[PDB]
Nucleic acid binder design. Structure first.
Length: 141
RNA sequence: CCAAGAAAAGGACUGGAAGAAAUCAUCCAAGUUGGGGACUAUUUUCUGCCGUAUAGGCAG
DNA sequence: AGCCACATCCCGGCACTCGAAGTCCCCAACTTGGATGATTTCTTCCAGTCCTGGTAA
DNA sequence: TTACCTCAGTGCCGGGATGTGGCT
């Protein structure tokens, strides 16, 4: 789900990790420069979790472990939880489709859900026509 | 276990000078707001003595 | 046909009403005629510097 | 070291009881 999307201009400067000469030189050079594109995100995820064992562990302990397991890296950038001074339960679990869907219907109108497409495209010209006709269609990797 | 893993763009700076928006002008004519009506009830405030006294002070 | 488990079912029981005036009805809402001319819209000079290749002679 | 190369209602609540359906 996409709530915020901001494009950032410019490009990163590399660390001076390369000596100017291998020996008898006290000068440091810059490896080289690349031209990329970066952005800041705000997003929610809904993961379908399954436990093979007949007896499950729906406990506070597991909610702590779900907070610990969360990676710090995402899409090459840095991932953070919501700020501490305004913290609420950002890591809830549902075992009912009716309760979960009801809560999701309340999301702000200016955000986007991203769904899989049906169309089969074999060229950029076919993509050009599909994009001219729809307004909801986007190419992705 | 993410076109994966690591990363300091920094240092300095004078926009200035000068100016005439002006002349003219007719909003008018007519007009029916009207007819009817309960603030008191299950109220609480009585009965006396002193004092010239509808003044002022008192017991029950 | 006889025996046992599990469904509900109806009477006795229990708890609530709850303070505490009323505030006007109905029908109509304007026609006509015109919106100005003549003139002009700036000129001088300037527009940084340095670092951040791979490959083979 | 260097050179190269791009656009009168109602709502729970207890408790004993009436009655029933399946197995032997």
């Amino acid at each position: 789900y996409l709530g915020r999307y901001s494009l950032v201009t410019g490009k990163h400067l590399p660390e001076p990790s390369k000596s100017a000469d291998p020996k008898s030189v006290s000068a440091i050079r810059r490896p080289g420069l690349l031209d990329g594109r970066y952005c800041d995100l705000g997003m929610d995820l809904i993961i379908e979790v399954h436990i093979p064992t007949g007896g499950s562990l729906p406990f506070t302990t597991c909610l702590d472990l779900l907070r610990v397991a969360l990676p710090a890296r995402f899409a090459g950038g840095c991932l953070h939880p919501p700020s501490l001074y305004e913290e609420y339960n950002w890591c809830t679990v549902y075992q009912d489709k009716s309760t979960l869907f009801t809560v999701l219907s309340r999301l702000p109108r200016y955000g986007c859900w991203i769904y899989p497409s049906d169309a089969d495209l074999r060229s950029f010209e076919e993509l050009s026509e599909a994009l001219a006709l729809d307004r909801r269609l986007r190419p992705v990797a």
